[PDB]
């Protein structure tokens, strides 16, 4: 905004305003499980 | 001005406002499982 008024005299006014803001966020995450269950053959037995 | 008298007044004012917000993201998930049985020990492969 600039306002200049003169009546005869000289007046000069100058104003400048600048504003800049940036905001960034990154969120990444993972969760995983690996369950496994096996069993041998072992043909033998205890049938006694 | 009327006739000595002279008067002059000038006023100027401007404003500007801007806003820009952008957010883009993707999340993916996929799970696969299996189960099997085999009825010598070499066949366990």
From Swiss-Prot, chain A:
Residues 3-24 are annotated as: Disordered. C-, N- and O-glycosylated. O-glycosylated with core 1 or possibly core 8 glycans. It is found in: Secreted; Target cell membrane. Residues 9-18 have a biased composition (Low complexity). Transmembrane segments: none annotated. Belongs to the complement C6/C7/C8/C9 family. Monomer or dimer; as a C5b-7 complex it can also form multimeric rosettes. Component of the membrane attack complex (MAC), composed of complement C5b, C6, C7, C8A, C8B, C8G and multiple copies of the pore-forming subunit C9. It is linked to Complement component 7 deficiency: A rare defect of the complement classical pathway associated with susceptibility to severe recurrent infections, predominantly by Neisseria gonorrhoeae or Neisseria meningitidis. Component of the membrane attack complex (MAC), a multiprotein complex activated by the complement cascade, which inserts into a target cell membrane and forms a pore, leading to target cell membrane rupture and cell lysis. The MAC is initiated by proteolytic cleavage of C5 into complement C5b in response to the classical, alternative, lectin and GZMK complement pathways. The complement pathways consist in a cascade of proteins that leads to phagocytosis and breakdown of pathogens and signaling that strengthens the adaptive immune system. C7 serves as a membrane anchor. This is Complement component C7.
Swiss-Prot record, chain B:
The chain crosses the membrane at residues 1-9. All cysteine residues are assumed to be cross-linked to one another. Individual modules containing an even number of conserved cysteine residues are supposed to have disulfide linkages only within the same module. It is found in: Secreted; Target cell membrane. Coiled coil: none annotated. Belongs to the complement C6/C7/C8/C9 family. Component of the membrane attack complex (MAC), a multiprotein complex activated by the complement cascade, which inserts into a target cell membrane and forms a pore, leading to target cell membrane rupture and cell lysis. The MAC is initiated by proteolytic cleavage of C5 into complement C5b in response to the classical, alternative, lectin and GZMK complement pathways. The complement pathways consist in a cascade of proteins that leads to phagocytosis and breakdown of pathogens and signaling that strengthens the adaptive immune system. It is linked to Complement component 6 deficiency: A rare defect of the complement classical pathway associated with susceptibility to severe recurrent infections, predominantly by Neisseria gonorrhoeae or Neisseria meningitidis. Component of the membrane attack complex (MAC), composed of complement C5b, C6, C7, C8A, C8B, C8G and multiple copies of the pore-forming subunit C9. This is Complement component C6. It comes from Homo sapiens.
